[PDB]
Amino acid sequence: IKAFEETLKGFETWLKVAMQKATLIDYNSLTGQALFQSAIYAPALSFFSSMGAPFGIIETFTLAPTKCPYLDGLKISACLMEQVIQNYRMIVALIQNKLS
Amino acid sequence: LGKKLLEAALIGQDDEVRILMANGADVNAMDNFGHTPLHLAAMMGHLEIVEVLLKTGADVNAFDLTGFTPLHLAAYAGHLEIVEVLLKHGADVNAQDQDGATPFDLAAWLGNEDIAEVLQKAA
């Protein structure tokens, strides 16, 4: 259970950075799209996999840009980051059910 | 052991990193995005794990599939002490992603002014 706590701590350490920088990333630029993938989406996937593993939760989080209908790349990035956080809440609800 | 090292280096499990290295984990292990453990620890700010990876032969200038180096990702996240350690171990300040962005560029665009000044000095 210690490992799971360690995963939550890493996730929240990552999130504090991702949540502020996401507002500055232009998702429509080549570099911004790549940085979002490398530094936001990819770590999120690893955290979500580590969170779900010990509880049998096997889900694959995927970005949904169709739900971010904005011309401004900065607002797309903030919208996609919101999806990441929502997925965290979804997995946590599943875990709490398992534990209960 | 590579996937366990990538996970422990991202999460910040110092003990587990040391155990994995002592059991012969590949310091060059790569995730599905081209990241090495050092990419993930530098981005996260995990200093001691960064030092452990460097001491065990990590390429300080490895590129992930999106063209970012560990210096890029530390400059992005705002980890000044990491940036300084990477530079001391030969990190390339002129590394560019696939559209020409350097570590300085990322620091400037993302508002990490201290790092941007350090990288400009080094250039």
Residue numbers in the entry:
A (entry chain B): 205 to 304
B (entry chain A): 16 to 138
Q: What sentences appear in the manuscript?
A:
The two complex structures revealed that each asymmetric unit contained one DARPin molecule and a fragment of CagI that had undergone proteolysis during crystallisation. Interactions between DARPins and CagI are widespread along the groove and extend to the concave face formed by the DARPin variable loops that wrap around α5. Interestingly, sequences of DARPin K2 and K5 differed only by a single amino-acid at position 125, being a leucine for K5 and a phenylalanine for K2 suggesting that the binding modes of the two DARPins were similar but with a 10-fold increase in affinity for K2 compared to K5. Comparison of the structure of CagI205-304 (from the CagI:K5 complex) with AF model monomer showed that the prediction was indeed remarkably correct, with a rmsd of 0.9 Å for 103 Cα.
While the composition of the pilus is unclear, CagI is present at the surface of the bacterium and required for pilus formation. Using Alpha Fold 2 and Small Angle X-ray scattering, it was found that CagI forms elongated dimers mediated by rod-shape N-terminal domains (CagIN) prolonged by globular C-terminal domains (CagIC).
